[PDB]
Each structure stands twice: as structure tokens, then as C-alpha cells.
């Protein structure tokens, strides 16, 4: 909404993977977004991507990793 | 090369297990070194055996145990590491005057990475030994080198 008041929503993409949403959706959230960004990139065009916040992605993946018995750090 | 310069090789024996060489041979090097020392002891002669460092023997034995499936203990070291250190260190005995009074002397060494004394291995060695010759990092700086 904030973007749509200031006239700028139409040149941005928003990807959502909320906290109510299942653990693989959050995990796969950054990798998918970057696929759209690469398509803009490889047409020689300039682009940007903000991955907010990757630490919560690390958490989303943690549950998966812990059940997959992969070492803890 | 320092020993050969100072002429200390004609009574010295060097037992070795370098890092590249296998974990079995790394475990086995203190215990095979013990025997060379014991021969002197038995005959009524004297020796002194430096076992530097035993903390890395524990890591050798850890690798060994976990890939034969012996459950990790406190800090991943197996629940019988103390038994290794105990059985080795006590072969630094003196004998009765029938046997000639020969004694193996031992100097074990524990190279500690953080300097934590609440780790399992450093504790384990302290009990076994009759004395401690604490060396500290700070005192190196202060101008006592070594």
C-alpha cells in the first residue's frame, strides 16, 4: 500500500512467504525470487533484489535440517 | 637436526606418527613408544619418555571409535579415554633393588586450544599425574621465553 500511494508499486515485485506458511515455502522463498531477477539480468538489463531477512529463512530451513539429521552449528 | 647439532643423539630414540599418516598409527604411537622405554626399566637402566601430545591421541581414538560405532561421550570423546591414559602413564615405575632400581620417567603433555580446564581430557590427565608444571600464555609475553 505504501508503494501504491507513492506511485512505485508497478516497477517492483513483491514475493511473500509469511510466518504462518509451511517450512519449505520459506526456504524456497529467496531462490525463486532470484529466478525472476535473473531473467531481467540476462536480458542485459539492470535489476535489484532485497532478501528480507535471510536469518528467518535459516530458521525455516533449520526445522527441515534437524529432521534430516544434518550437523548442528 | 637441533639434536644432532647439540650431540644429544646417542641415547635418544624418536617415535613418530605425523599428521598425514593414518589414525590407527596415530593411536598406536605412544603405546609402542612405552615399550622401548620399558626395556631400559626392566634391565635396571633409566629413561624418560615424553608423550607429546596425548590430547591428539584422544582425537585419534575418537575417530577410531566413532567409525566402529561407540557412542559419543562428553565432548564426543569416547567413554574410556581415561582408561587409555591411565594404563600408559603408570609404566613409569621404579622397581625393587633385586631388579636394579630401573625407572621409566614420564612427561605427558596436553596442548590445549582455548586453555579450558573444564574439558574432559585435561581433567583426566591431571588425576593420573603426581604433579603439574603449568605453563601459561600470558607469561610468554611478559618475557619468559620459553
Amino acid at each position: 500500500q505504501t508503494l501504491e500511494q507513492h506511485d512505485a508499486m508497478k516497477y517492483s515485485i513483491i514475493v511473500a512467504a509469511t510466518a504462518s506458511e509451511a517450512a519449505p515455502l520459506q526456504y524456497l522463498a529467496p531462490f525463486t525470487a532470484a529466478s525472476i531477477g535473473e531473467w531481467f539480468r540476462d536480458n542485459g538489463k539492470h535489476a535489484l533484489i532485497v532478501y528480507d531477512d535471510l536469518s528467518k529463512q535459516a530458521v525455516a530451513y533449520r526445522q527441515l535440517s534437524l529432521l534430516l539429521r544434518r550437523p548442528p552449528g | 637436526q637441533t639434536l644432532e647439532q647439540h650431540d644429544a643423539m646417542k641415547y635418544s630414540i624418536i617415535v613418530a606418527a605425523t599428521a598425514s599418516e593414518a589414525a590407527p598409527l596415530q593411536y598406536l604411537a605412544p603405546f609402542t613408544a612405552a615399550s622401548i622405554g620399558e626395556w631400559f626399566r626392566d634391565n635396571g637402566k633409566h629413561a624418560l619418555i615424553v608423550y607429546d601430545d596425548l590430547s591428539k591421541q584422544a582425537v585419534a581414538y575418537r575417530q577410531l571409535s566413532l567409525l566402529l560405532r561407540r557412542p559419543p561421550g562428553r565432548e564426543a570423546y569416547p567413554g574410556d579415554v581415561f582408561y587409555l591414559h591411565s594404563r600408559l602413564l603408570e609404566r613409569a615405575a621404579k622397581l625393587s633393588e633385586k631388579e636394579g632400581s630401573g625407572s621409566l620417567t614420564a612427561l605427558p603433555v596436553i596442548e590445549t586450544q582455548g586453555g579450558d580446564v573444564s574439558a574432559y581430557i585435561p581433567t583426566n590427565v591431571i588425576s593420573i599425574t603426581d604433579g603439574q608444571i603449568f605453563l601459561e600464555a600470558e607469561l610468554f609475553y611478559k618475557g619468559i621465553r620459553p
Binding site: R69, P72 | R69, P71, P72, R74, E75, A76
Partner: protein
């Protein structure tokens, strides 16, 4: 005159020290907390590897 300045001065110095030590109590408190949290996680993991094997 000197003795009065001295007793006044020690009040001033020692006040600034109360604040200086305080700034440092708060900094070592942040470390203390972080440090306890890591110990708890590292304790836990040892049990987990054991149960699992």
C-alpha cells in the same frame, strides 16, 4: 585551600568512576548472557548425537 580542593576533587573523580564502572557492568552483562546461551545449545547437541547413534 589545597586540602579543600583535594576532598572536592575526589568526589568528582569517584563519581565519574561510578559511571565508568557502570558502562562496563552493562557491557560484561551482554557477554555473560550470550555466553550462557551457547553453553546450553552445545550441551544439548551432545545428548542428541548420542541418542541418535
Amino acid at each position: 585551600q589545597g586540602y579543600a580542593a583535594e576532598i572536592s576533587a575526589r568526589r568528582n573523580a569517584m563519581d565519574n568512576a561510578s559511571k565508568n564502572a557502570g558502562d562496563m557492568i552493562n557491557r560484561y552483562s551482554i557477554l555473560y548472557n550470550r555466553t550462557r546461551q551457547a553453553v546450553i545449545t552445545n550441551e544439548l547437541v551432545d545428548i542428541i548425537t548420542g541418542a541418535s547413534s
